[PDB]
Ligand binder design. Structure first.
Ligand SMILES: CC(C)CCC[C@@H](C)[C@H]1CC[C@H]2[C@@H]3CC=C4C[C@@H](OC(=O)CCC(=O)O)CC[C@]4(C)[C@H]3CC[C@]12C
Ligand SMILES: CC(C)CCC[C@@H](C)[C@H]1CC[C@H]2[C@@H]3CC=C4C[C@@H](OC(=O)CCC(=O)O)CC[C@]4(C)[C@H]3CC[C@]12C
Ligand SMILES: CC(C)CCC[C@@H](C)[C@H]1CC[C@H]2[C@@H]3CC=C4C[C@@H](OC(=O)CCC(=O)O)CC[C@]4(C)[C@H]3CC[C@]12C
Ligand SMILES: C[N+](C)(C)CCO
Length: 415
């Protein structure tokens, strides 16, 4: 066949990497300053925990219908739906600047959650469709890095944008409205860019594989059968459990970092945001380094076990060092912990893709993400309860025990 590369692909990626960013910024914006919103709305921290967890709750059941819609309708419809849903959720958030309108913020968060189901699975498909064989890996990696950067921006900005001025309600409302207006304007702009430039497919397949895929007639795939076949493979089940445990621990830590820091350090929301940003940035660095190191080594189990062990060590040291009352210690421990845990995720995802090579990669990715969402919900609930009742240390020890169980499971994996 005939294959060629078009410049538009870059734009198609860039816009995505932008509107996948904003969604991430909206996932944690409430959690990082959860105390401020708790004071403003007169609600409990469980409300902010649910604001964080609605992403997982919505993603869990809608992953497979979204995959079917993407496979049948195409990429353009999925991108349009994601961008429009994100923009609409932000606009709904704009109308939630009243102390008695928490439900409006909840509705906006639900809309962003529904957008996430379309947003999350895009990277691999966009990279395959629009980029060549020597750039597909780079395109997917930079898309995931854009999502991670959005998470980091959500960690960093809100603490500074909205100071905890509980004394005056007008100033807090003004700051919240300003943040919501900025986010909604950015989301609407990115939706306009997606509607204008996000083409369904390039004129020529970027690579021979994409040309063959286009030439080959579409064939229906039974997602239920694929899931049933995948569940048979015990090693895949173990890898799924371990990846879910790791991702859920990361999500719970991200959600409850504000509470953990506020328990010991008072009036340090900006420092908490900086700690989260350092954690996520070190996570990206570790992800890149681990990906390249895995590509060079060709070993999929020893690296996974070592990374899991180091992540558990980081979690334990963070737990036993957070109470020392030194912010530098918290910065360092969070940085190393995030490095290890966030670098684990790409390794586990690639291992799952490789081990299940006969099976469809999309179904495996969807199952991995669903397990991560469920584990994150459970871990966030348990750790929040423990922190509220017994303090951060109890929930941190619970997470450490879960990480040790994950190490055991990873050791039991065979391949
Ligand atoms: C990781 C462990 C602890 C939990 C794993 C749970 C999964 C087995 C769940 C999570 C999401 C579920 C899915 C959520 C939504 C749907 C769509 C649903 O669609 C229909 O009702 C029509 C299907 C058809 O077209 O035949 C079918 C079941 C399915 C795939 C579910 C099958 C079971 C899944 C994969
Ligand atoms: C559209 C899709 C994404 C699903 C949307 C589901 C949410 C709207 C639901 C799921 C779980 C619900 C929460 C489950 C439990 C609680 C605790 C509940 O707390 C109490 O009743 C006691 C409060 C106190 O301690 O004073 C308040 C409602 C809330 C936050 C619920 C609010 C609505 C939530 C977030
Ligand atoms: C695989 C799953 C099912 C394991 C679940 C285990 C949990 C039930 C464990 C994990 C961490 C434990 C907690 C770790 C630390 C403490 C502090 C402990 O504090 C005390 O009152 C005694 C010690 C002291 O004096 O400080 C009370 C029990 C508690 C909350 C533990 C209760 C039981 C927990 C939640
Ligand atoms: C993918 N996020 C980290 C943005 C949300 C998880 O529920």
């Amino acid at each position: 066949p005939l294959t060629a590369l078009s410049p538009r692909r870059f734009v198609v990626l860039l816009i995505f990497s932008l509107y996948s960013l904003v969604n991430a910024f909206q996932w944690i914006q409430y959690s990082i300053i959860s105390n401020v919103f708790e004071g403003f709305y007169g609600v409990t921290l469980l409300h902010i925990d649910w604001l964080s967890m609605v992403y997982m709750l919505a993603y869990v059941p809608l992953i497979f219908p979204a995959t079917w819609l993407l496979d049948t309708r195409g990429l353009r419809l999925t991108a349009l739906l994601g961008s429009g849903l994100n923009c609409l959720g932000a606009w709904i958030k704009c109308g939630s600047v009243q102390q008695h309108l928490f439900w409006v913020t909840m509705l906006g968060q639900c809309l962003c959650s529904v957008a996430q189901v379309f947003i999350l699975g895009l990277p691999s498909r966009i990279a395959s469709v629009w980029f060549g064989p020597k750039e597909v890996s780079t395109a997917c990696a930079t898309a995931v890095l854009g999502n991670q950067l959005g998470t980091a921006v959500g960690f960093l900005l809100p603490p500074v944008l909205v100071p905890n001025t509980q004394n005056d309600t007008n100033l807090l409302a003004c700051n919240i409205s300003t943040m919501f207006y900025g986010t909604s304007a950015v989301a609407t702009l990115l939706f306009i860019l997606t509607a204008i430039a996000f083409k369904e497919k390039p004129r020529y397949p970027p690579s021979q594989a994409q040309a063959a895929l286009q030439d080959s007639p579409p064939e229906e795939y039974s997602y239920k059968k694929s899931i049933r076949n995948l569940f048979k493979n015990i090693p895949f089940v173990l890898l799924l459990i371990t990846y879910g445990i790791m991702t859920g621990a990361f999500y719970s830590v991200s959600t409850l970092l504000n509470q953990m820091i506020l328990t010991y350090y008072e009036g340090e929301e900006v420092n908490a945001g900086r700690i989260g940003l350092t954690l996520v940035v070190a996570g990206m660095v570790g992800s890149i380094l681990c990906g390249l190191w895995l590509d060079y080594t060709k070993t999929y189990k020893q690296t996974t076990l070592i990374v899991y062990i180091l992540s558990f060590i980081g979690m334990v040291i963070f737990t036993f060092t957070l109470d020392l009352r030194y912010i530098i210690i918290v910065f360092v421990t969070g940085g190393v912990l995030g490095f290890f845990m966030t670098g684990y995720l790409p390794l586990g995802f690639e291992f799952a893709v490789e081990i299940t090579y006969p099976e469809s990669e999309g179904t495996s990715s969807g199952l991995l993400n669903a397990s991560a969402q469920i584990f994150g919900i459970l871990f966030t609930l348990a750790q929040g309860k423990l922190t509220s009742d017994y303090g951060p240390k109890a929930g941190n020890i619970f997470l450490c025990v879960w990480m040790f169980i994950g190490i055991i499971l990873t050791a039991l994996i065979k391949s």
